[PDB]
Scaffold this active site. Structure first.
Site, PDB file in Angstrom:
ATOM      1  N   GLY A  22       0.816  -1.215   0.000  1.00  0.00           N
ATOM      2  CA  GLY A  22       0.000   0.000   0.000  1.00  0.00           C
ATOM      3  C   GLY A  22       0.846   1.260   0.000  1.00  0.00           C
ATOM      4  O   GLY A  22       2.001   1.239   0.434  1.00  0.00           O
ATOM      5  N   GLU A  23       0.266   2.353  -0.495  1.00  0.00           N
ATOM      6  CA  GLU A  23       0.932   3.656  -0.539  1.00  0.00           C
ATOM      7  C   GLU A  23       0.438   4.512   0.630  1.00  0.00           C
ATOM      8  O   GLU A  23      -0.714   4.958   0.637  1.00  0.00           O
ATOM      9  CB  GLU A  23       0.668   4.340  -1.891  1.00  0.00           C
ATOM     10  CG  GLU A  23       1.580   5.527  -2.220  1.00  0.00           C
ATOM     11  CD  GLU A  23       1.071   6.887  -1.741  1.00  0.00           C
ATOM     12  OE1 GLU A  23      -0.119   7.028  -1.380  1.00  0.00           O
ATOM     13  OE2 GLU A  23       1.878   7.843  -1.737  1.00  0.00           O
ATOM     14  N   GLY A  24       1.302   4.703   1.629  1.00  0.00           N
ATOM     15  CA  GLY A  24       1.020   5.589   2.762  1.00  0.00           C
ATOM     16  C   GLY A  24       1.326   7.042   2.438  1.00  0.00           C
ATOM     17  O   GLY A  24       1.844   7.359   1.361  1.00  0.00           O
ATOM     18  N   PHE A  26       3.385   9.196   4.365  1.00  0.00           N
ATOM     19  CA  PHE A  26       4.822   9.400   4.594  1.00  0.00           C
ATOM     20  C   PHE A  26       5.696   8.657   3.575  1.00  0.00           C
ATOM     21  O   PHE A  26       6.783   9.129   3.232  1.00  0.00           O
ATOM     22  CB  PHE A  26       5.204   8.966   6.017  1.00  0.00           C
ATOM     23  N   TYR A 100       4.704  -8.245   9.449  1.00  0.00           N
ATOM     24  CA  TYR A 100       3.764  -8.380   8.342  1.00  0.00           C
ATOM     25  C   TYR A 100       2.474  -8.989   8.863  1.00  0.00           C
ATOM     26  O   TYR A 100       2.504  -9.906   9.688  1.00  0.00           O
ATOM     27  CB  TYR A 100       4.365  -9.282   7.261  1.00  0.00           C
ATOM     28  CG  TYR A 100       3.448  -9.625   6.101  1.00  0.00           C
ATOM     29  CD1 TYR A 100       2.845  -8.627   5.332  1.00  0.00           C
ATOM     30  CD2 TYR A 100       3.215 -10.958   5.749  1.00  0.00           C
ATOM     31  CE1 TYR A 100       2.018  -8.947   4.262  1.00  0.00           C
ATOM     32  CE2 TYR A 100       2.401 -11.288   4.678  1.00  0.00           C
ATOM     33  CZ  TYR A 100       1.805 -10.286   3.935  1.00  0.00           C
ATOM     34  OH  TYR A 100       0.999 -10.638   2.871  1.00  0.00           O
ATOM     35  N   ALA A 101       1.353  -8.479   8.355  1.00  0.00           N
ATOM     36  CA  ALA A 101       0.020  -8.927   8.737  1.00  0.00           C
ATOM     37  C   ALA A 101      -0.705  -9.317   7.456  1.00  0.00           C
ATOM     38  O   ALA A 101      -1.223  -8.456   6.749  1.00  0.00           O
ATOM     39  CB  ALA A 101      -0.711  -7.813   9.464  1.00  0.00           C
ATOM     40  N   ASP A 155      -5.825   8.313  16.028  1.00  0.00           N
ATOM     41  CA  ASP A 155      -6.653   7.843  14.909  1.00  0.00           C
ATOM     42  C   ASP A 155      -6.889   6.325  14.995  1.00  0.00           C
ATOM     43  O   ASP A 155      -6.697   5.595  14.024  1.00  0.00           O
ATOM     44  CB  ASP A 155      -6.025   8.233  13.552  1.00  0.00           C
ATOM     45  CG  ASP A 155      -6.930   7.913  12.360  1.00  0.00           C
ATOM     46  OD1 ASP A 155      -8.164   7.837  12.529  1.00  0.00           O
ATOM     47  OD2 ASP A 155      -6.400   7.724  11.246  1.00  0.00           O
ATOM     48  N   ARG A 159      -9.705   0.244  10.549  1.00  0.00           N
ATOM     49  CA  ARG A 159      -8.774   0.394   9.421  1.00  0.00           C
ATOM     50  C   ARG A 159      -7.287   0.486   9.826  1.00  0.00           C
ATOM     51  O   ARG A 159      -6.420   0.125   9.033  1.00  0.00           O
ATOM     52  CB  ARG A 159      -9.167   1.598   8.544  1.00  0.00           C
ATOM     53  CG  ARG A 159      -8.970   2.963   9.187  1.00  0.00           C
ATOM     54  CD  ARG A 159      -9.360   4.097   8.250  1.00  0.00           C
ATOM     55  NE  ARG A 159      -9.059   5.399   8.854  1.00  0.00           N
ATOM     56  CZ  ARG A 159      -9.808   6.029   9.762  1.00  0.00           C
ATOM     57  NH1 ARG A 159     -10.959   5.516  10.202  1.00  0.00           N
ATOM     58  NH2 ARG A 159      -9.402   7.203  10.233  1.00  0.00           N
ATOM     59  N   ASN A 160      -7.004   0.973  11.040  1.00  0.00           N
ATOM     60  CA  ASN A 160      -5.635   1.043  11.579  1.00  0.00           C
ATOM     61  C   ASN A 160      -5.331  -0.073  12.595  1.00  0.00           C
ATOM     62  O   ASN A 160      -4.484   0.087  13.468  1.00  0.00           O
ATOM     63  CB  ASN A 160      -5.363   2.431  12.185  1.00  0.00           C
ATOM     64  CG  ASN A 160      -5.371   3.542  11.145  1.00  0.00           C
ATOM     65  OD1 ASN A 160      -4.966   3.342  10.002  1.00  0.00           O
ATOM     66  ND2 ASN A 160      -5.825   4.724  11.541  1.00  0.00           N
ATOM     67  N   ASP A 173       0.085   2.048  12.714  1.00  0.00           N
ATOM     68  CA  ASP A 173       0.287   3.497  12.549  1.00  0.00           C
ATOM     69  C   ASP A 173       0.110   4.305  13.841  1.00  0.00           C
ATOM     70  O   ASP A 173      -0.670   5.257  13.902  1.00  0.00           O
ATOM     71  CB  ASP A 173      -0.600   4.031  11.408  1.00  0.00           C
ATOM     72  CG  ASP A 173      -0.187   3.503  10.031  1.00  0.00           C
ATOM     73  OD1 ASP A 173       0.945   2.982   9.872  1.00  0.00           O
ATOM     74  OD2 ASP A 173      -0.999   3.626   9.091  1.00  0.00           O
TER      75      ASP A 173
END
Ligand SMILES: C=CC(=O)Nc1cccc(CN2C(=O)N(c3c(Cl)c(OC)cc(OC)c3Cl)Cc3cnc(NCCCCN(CC)CC)nc32)c1
Length: 280
Positions: A22-24, A26, A100-101, A155, A159-160, A173
């Site tokens: 995925g593209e974060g 940061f 890794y998840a 946050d 989703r996090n 995160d």
């Protein structure tokens, strides 16, 4: 340049970079295999997630990546957070290596496991009552640990939280839509605390027992802060006990000091997991 840290340094050739995860904001994240991460067993390959700066990235992205890494070093290890495993800092671009998840974020995980609205093209087995409560317990344990190390997430949401191959819940995160997870004092006054995270955990509980439902469905952002001041709380999910709904309501106390701690939430959830059966 960046100084070396041999506590965390892994040579560049020990890392086999794989497909994007995925593209974060940061930077970009990619799947990889680390050879000899456990130096006692140097012939073993461990699947890991690797964060690096994007192609179009700036000095602010570099310092935020470095800050995240350094923050993760200080916070230390816990089963229910995404842990720092290593870093490549010398030869060229900075890689930050973390656990890794394989099953992805909790929201998609739960949504995929709804009875066939299920949006997934690949549905999965329904989660029992005990599984859902166990998920809440693990997320609370992670937050209890983060809080005990004075880390305010800011946050917390399904989703996090990420899910491993062994279905272990891991807070994501933490070393850094969203308004619907914010406590009124965070939403209005920008005051983030451990108690504002507790509010967020209540919305995360409601996500769990709606199997990844959207909170305040159809409510605009402009309307929400007014409605929360008026004392509106989300209704109980259809498939939720009154006890677990009361816990959400306690998390959503207008007065921050009247919310339970993660320490207490872990204790309450421990009791409920024992009293909840797998037959349900
Ligand atoms: C559904 C997608 C999803 O949840 N994506 C996703 C969500 C959040 C974060 C990521 C990327 N990534 C991080 O940012 N993570 C991360 C985290 Cl959480 C972090 O917080 C402390 C710090 C990090 O770098 C310093 C990284 Cl790289 C690690 C990570 C672990 N496992 C996965 N599995 C995706 C495995 C997803 C594979 N899916 C198939 C496409 C399974 C459905 N992804 C990770 C992907």
């Amino acid at each position: 340049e960046l100084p070396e840290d041999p506590r965390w340094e892994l040579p560049r050739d020990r890392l086999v970079l794989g497909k994007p995860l995925g593209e974060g904001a940061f930077g970009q994240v990619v799947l990889a295999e680390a050879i000899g991460l456990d130096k006692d067993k140097p012939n073993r390959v461990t699947k890991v997630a690797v964060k690096m700066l994007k192609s179009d990235a700036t000095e602010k992205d570099l310092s935020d990546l470095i800050s995240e890494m350094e923050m993760m070093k200080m916070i230390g290890k816990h089963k229910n957070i995404i842990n720092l495993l290593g870093a490549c800092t010398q030869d060229g671009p900075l890689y930050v290596i973390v656990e890794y998840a394989s099953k992805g974020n909790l929201r998609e995980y739960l949504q995929a496991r709804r009875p066939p609205y299920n949006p997934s093209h690949n549905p999965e087995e329904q989660l029992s009552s005990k599984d859902l409560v166990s998920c809440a317990y693990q997320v609370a344990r992670g937050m209890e640990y983060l809080a005990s190390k004075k880390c305010i997430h800011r946050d917390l949401a399904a989703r996090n939280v990420l899910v491993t191959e062994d279905n272990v819940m891991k807070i994501a995160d933490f070393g850094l839509l969203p308004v619907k997870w914010m406590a009124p004092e965070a939403l209005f006054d920008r005051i983030y605390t451990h108690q504002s995270d507790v509010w967020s955990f209540g919305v995360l509980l409601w996500e769990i027992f709606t199997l990844g439902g959207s909170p305040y469905p159809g409510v605009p952002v402009e309307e929400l802060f007014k409605l929360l001041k008026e004392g509106h709380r989300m209704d109980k999910p259809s498939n939720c006990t009154n006890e677990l709904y009361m816990m959400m309501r306690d998390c959503w106390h207008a007065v921050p000091s009247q919310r339970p701690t993660f320490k207490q939430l872990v204790e309450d959830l421990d009791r409920i997991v024992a009293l909840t059966s797998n037959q349900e």
